[PDB]
Amino acid sequence: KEYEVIKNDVEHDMKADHITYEGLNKEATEGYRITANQKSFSKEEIEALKDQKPLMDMPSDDHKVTSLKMKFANPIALSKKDIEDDAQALVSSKIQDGEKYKLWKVDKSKKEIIFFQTYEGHYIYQKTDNPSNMIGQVVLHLNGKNEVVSYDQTTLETFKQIQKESLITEMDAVELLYYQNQLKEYSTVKSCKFGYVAQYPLTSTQVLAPVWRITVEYEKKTVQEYFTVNALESTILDT
Amino acid sequence: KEYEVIKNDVEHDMKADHITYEGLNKEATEGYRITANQKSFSKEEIEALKDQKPLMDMPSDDHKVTSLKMKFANPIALSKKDIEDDAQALVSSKIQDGEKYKLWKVDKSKKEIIFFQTYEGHYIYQKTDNPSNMIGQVVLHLNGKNEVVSYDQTTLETFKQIQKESLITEMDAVELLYYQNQLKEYSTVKSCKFGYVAQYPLTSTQVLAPVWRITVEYEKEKKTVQEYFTVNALESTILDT
Ligand SMILES: [Cl-]
């Protein structure tokens, strides 16, 4: 074979450029391309949220609500040095479909706690920039003594695995990055974590792709960079 | 640039194995993922076809007709040695949206000529097996002396471009075949033509991705045998940084 000759050429260049790998799988598994619908919240779901007052236009004949901005009637105390667990606990038991979200980031400058919707317990990685690219998140807003005041929410529902495929390994993903010239010399691969990204929208439906999220620290000073590499092996089709 | 190292390794390996190729674009191009709806054939549309009686159930409250199956009152003579042009003429003049379809294969074993629907000049490459894979085709059925007796039709409409992306180069696509151990020693790369394939369904919507349709030929008392490959044209290895 030639995949082999090429692969270990990339090995013998990575060793040349002193690139470090960490506990990475070399055994392929099976994966799926997923399509999910954008949840549309109804009148009856919204008012069914006890002890919570809305901060958005209710739905109607013209208007659909795919984004909840809700205010708690009384703000909820979160522990100082246990903040992360208390935050999960709050999301699970008070927010609709809360079980389905995992904690991403505690941003202290923005005074918020960000949660990503998962699939099979794996992050659906998204941009924490803005509400545009918030397909599936819960963002908790805090004030003062770290009490949650309001939260923003969007949800994916009705998942369909539409296409099965073989997935590239972890090491595969890293070689693929080095190939694309995304690794300077002496650069370390800190982690290689699995999850999804919305590859593109359809009418009212996102199409998810499984990915490896790679975290490299390297020099330019020392910085971490994050790459989202496509886990799907869809190169050759059938004829 | 470390892809430049590896690409030129692959380039040499190919010369080592005597794989010849010519006039292949090394420059990146921009393409689109697209969608289309499966044409649903109304009653009006069906009994607007003159000198044609249907061989399928008419549409109803319960039913919808995405696939025609249509018989000519009097079968139409095709020509002996000019068969292909006579076929294209028939499809365009006598069939709904005929000019959108480009002739694909003449299959004497099944006694049927096959047209594939196109988009912006290119083929929607499909399988020629069952009618399940027949998302956009016209199939002429013949009997006796080259005379068209009937045809089956499926049509795509309402094409939308839903995401523009960078395509991989012609040259890239052939290297990809080699890399994955698909090309035999001493083979010739005859063509790298562009087109689309159905990636998967979604109710009435079909999602279509661009592909390179690479034809290769080699020897096998020598025989010149050909192989056809379809490589996904979309470059989508790195999605975010
Ligand atoms: Cl893809």
Side-chain angles (χ1 to χ4, degrees), chain A residues 2-239, chain B residues 2-241:
Chain A
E2 166 78 17
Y3 50 86
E4 194 58 31
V5 170
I6 295 302
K7 277 182 161 82
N8 78 289
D9 289 0
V10 181
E11 209 83 27
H12 260 73
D13 278 341
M14 288 191 67
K15 235 71 193 166
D17 290 0
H18 297 263
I19 302 188
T20 329
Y21 353 89
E22 300 201 342
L24 304 168
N25 222 283
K26 304 167 80 59
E27 311 303 330
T29 65
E30 288 291 327
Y32 297 97
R33 193 166 289 191
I34 335 306
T35 73
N37 294 359
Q38 197 68 246
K39 168 78 166 313
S40 183
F41 303 92
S42 56
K43 178 181 188 279
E44 288 138 327
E45 287 179 343
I46 291 175
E47 69 198 350
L49 296 171
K50 168 167 283 225
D51 296 319
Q52 290 180 49
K53 295 302 166 83
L55 307 185
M56 76 282 159
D57 281 317
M58 297 303 78
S60 75
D61 308 348
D62 197 298
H63 195 69
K64 296 133 284 178
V65 182
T66 85
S67 203
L68 281 167
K69 186 167 203 87
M70 232 68 178
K71 181 191 177 200
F72 291 106
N74 306 274
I76 293 151
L78 286 168
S79 182
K80 328 200 73 156
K81 303 191 177 208
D82 208 325
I83 186 161
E84 297 191 39
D85 280 317
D86 287 32
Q88 274 280 186
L90 166 49
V91 177
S92 282
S93 55
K94 284 182 154 46
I95 299 174
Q96 184 167 352
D97 297 316
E99 72 279 354
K100 302 203 182 294
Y101 295 89
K102 167 162 252 151
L103 179 38
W104 182 232
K105 188 177 183 165
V106 183
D107 196 303
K108 300 200 185 176
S109 59
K110 301 184 197 294
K111 288 211 299 302
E112 52 184 19
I113 305 187
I114 299 185
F115 289 80
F116 284 159
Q117 176 159 183
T118 88
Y119 183 77
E120 287 165 15
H122 296 290
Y123 287 116
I124 298 168
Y125 295 116
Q126 324 164 211
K127 286 167 159 204
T128 75
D129 278 325
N130 71 151
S132 308
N133 277 304
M134 186 185 36
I135 72 197
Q137 303 186 33
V138 174
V139 183
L140 296 183
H141 290 264
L142 301 184
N143 209 80
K145 270 216 165 66
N146 291 278
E147 312 170 314
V148 182
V149 170
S150 70
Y151 71 83
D152 295 314
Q153 177 178 14
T154 53
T155 321
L156 292 169
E157 73 184 338
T158 316
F159 292 76
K160 213 170 305 303
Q161 296 179 333
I162 55 165
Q163 193 183 5
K164 186 218 298 198
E165 289 199 27
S166 212
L167 296 176
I168 73 196
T169 78
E170 298 182 351
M171 193 61 206
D172 277 310
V174 164
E175 284 167 19
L176 209 59
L177 269 190
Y178 181 69
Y179 171 60
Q180 303 257 347
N181 207 30
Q182 298 302 341
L183 298 173
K184 277 196 150 67
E185 296 184 344
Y186 298 100
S187 52
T188 298
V189 165
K190 273 229 68 160
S191 70
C192 202
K193 297 276 185 176
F194 181 85
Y196 295 85
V197 293
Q199 223 181 161
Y200 50 91
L202 292 175
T203 292
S204 207
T205 309
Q206 293 296 83
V207 175
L208 301 191
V211 301
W212 288 111
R213 190 172 207 261
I214 302 176
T215 281
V216 155
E217 41 199 75
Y218 73 119
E219 306 200 306
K220 206 164 59 163
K221 288 162 47 278
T222 322
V223 233
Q224 278 185 18
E225 265 201 77
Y226 307 81
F227 302 93
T228 328
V229 180
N230 190 183
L232 291 174
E233 210 148 19
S234 190
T235 88
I236 275 186
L237 288 132
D238 169 39
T239 319
Chain B
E2 156 84 42
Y3 51 91
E4 239 70 48
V5 169
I6 293 295
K7 277 208 184 58
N8 119 295
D9 280 341
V10 171
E11 228 113 27
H12 279 67
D13 283 348
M14 284 181 75
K15 251 51 200 177
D17 287 312
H18 303 278
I19 288 162
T20 290
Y21 58 90
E22 295 202 313
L24 279 192
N25 200 3
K26 269 169 178 157
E27 288 289 285
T29 64
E30 298 280 315
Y32 305 102
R33 235 183 220 100
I34 65 205
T35 75
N37 283 323
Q38 200 62 246
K39 177 114 189 293
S40 185
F41 284 93
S42 79
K43 190 161 178 291
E44 241 211 341
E45 284 165 68
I46 293 171
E47 53 199 26
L49 304 175
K50 175 132 273 195
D51 294 358
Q52 301 185 30
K53 291 306 184 70
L55 301 180
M56 74 280 165
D57 296 302
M58 293 295 84
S60 63
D61 304 4
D62 199 299
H63 195 84
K64 285 216 305 168
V65 191
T66 67
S67 183
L68 283 190
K69 192 165 198 76
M70 213 79 205
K71 182 188 187 180
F72 287 116
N74 319 292
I76 299 137
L78 295 193
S79 198
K80 338 212 79 185
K81 287 140 198 155
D82 201 5
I83 194 149
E84 280 190 315
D85 295 346
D86 288 47
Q88 294 190 175
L90 188 100
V91 173
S92 296
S93 70
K94 278 177 147 56
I95 300 181
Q96 232 141 4
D97 295 306
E99 88 285 352
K100 300 181 187 260
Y101 296 89
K102 205 190 279 158
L103 157 64
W104 175 244
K105 184 171 186 176
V106 173
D107 193 333
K108 301 144 199 192
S109 42
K110 302 169 197 303
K111 300 207 289 297
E112 72 187 28
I113 304 170
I114 298 168
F115 294 64
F116 280 163
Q117 190 164 188
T118 75
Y119 171 73
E120 289 188 349
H122 312 289
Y123 277 119
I124 295 153
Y125 287 114
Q126 304 161 246
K127 300 190 179 176
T128 55
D129 307 335
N130 59 192
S132 290
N133 317 338
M134 196 186 42
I135 71 209
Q137 305 191 26
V138 167
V139 178
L140 303 185
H141 289 287
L142 334 181
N143 205 84
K145 254 189 164 65
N146 298 351
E147 278 172 14
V148 180
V149 178
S150 74
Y151 66 92
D152 315 316
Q153 185 164 35
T154 58
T155 307
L156 293 187
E157 77 195 343
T158 298
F159 289 93
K160 300 277 211 310
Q161 300 183 329
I162 68 179
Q163 184 210 46
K164 101 176 280 71
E165 281 196 2
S166 177
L167 305 203
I168 74 182
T169 69
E170 291 188 345
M171 184 62 224
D172 286 326
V174 162
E175 290 181 330
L176 229 49
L177 288 178
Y178 182 72
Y179 174 74
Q180 301 187 309
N181 215 221
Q182 297 293 278
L183 297 174
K184 303 204 182 52
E185 269 196 343
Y186 289 96
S187 46
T188 289
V189 181
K190 295 297 281 176
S191 77
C192 194
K193 303 273 181 205
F194 185 83
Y196 295 85
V197 303
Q199 221 170 176
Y200 53 79
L202 242 173
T203 320
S204 178
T205 308
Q206 288 273 312
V207 171
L208 296 146
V211 302
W212 294 109
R213 224 283 178 134
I214 294 168
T215 283
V216 164
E217 71 184 30
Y218 62 103
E219 300 289 74
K220 195 184 177 179
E221 183 171 323
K222 302 133 287 180
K223 196 106 164 49
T224 282
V225 154
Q226 317 164 57
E227 260 166 25
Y228 312 84
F229 299 97
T230 302
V231 168
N232 175 219
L234 283 163
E235 173 138 23
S236 47
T237 31
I238 290 183
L239 291 156
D240 209 285
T241 310

